[PDB]
Amino acid sequence: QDGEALFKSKPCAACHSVDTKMVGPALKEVAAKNAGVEGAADTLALHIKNGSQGVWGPIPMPPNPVTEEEAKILAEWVLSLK
Numbered sequence: 001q002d003g004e005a006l007f008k009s010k011p012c013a014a015c016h017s018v019d020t021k022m023v024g025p026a027l028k029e030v031a032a033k034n035a036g037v038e039g040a041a042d043t044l045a046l047h048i049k050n051g052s053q054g055v056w057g058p059i060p061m062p063p064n065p066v067t068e069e070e071a072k073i074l075a076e077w078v079l080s081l082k
């Protein structure tokens with residue numbers, strides 16, 4: 001309740017997903033990509049605010065209105081997804 005709920009209010013669900021997918025790699029598939037790199041939370045923060053591409057597909061992710069506070073938490077729950 002201190003990590004998943006945030007993903008809800010966060011439009012990250014509109015594009016990303018938890019047990020499926022639509023545009024970007026579901027945090028589940030992404031968690032496995034940055035799993036070995038548990039310290040990937042810092043790299044994601046730079047890929048979320050300034051968007052990022054080539055890491056998954058030719059679809060650059062538009063910058064989202066997220067700060068370091070929400071970007072950090074959301075990054076902690078995404079890494080703890082599984």
Ligand code: HEC
Nearest residue numbers: 012015024044047048052053054055056057059061064066
């Ligand atoms: C559709 C406009 C998206 C919304 C809304 C959010 N994200 Fe996204 N994200 C999107 C795409 C298409 C991609 C893949 C980009 C690529 O080419 O690889 C992503 C990727 C991420 C990642 C991983 C970045 C990487 O591994 O290099 C993260 C950590 C991520 N997105 C986070 C994130 C958050 C927290 C969002 C809500 C603020 C969010 N995304 C929304 C597309 C879209």
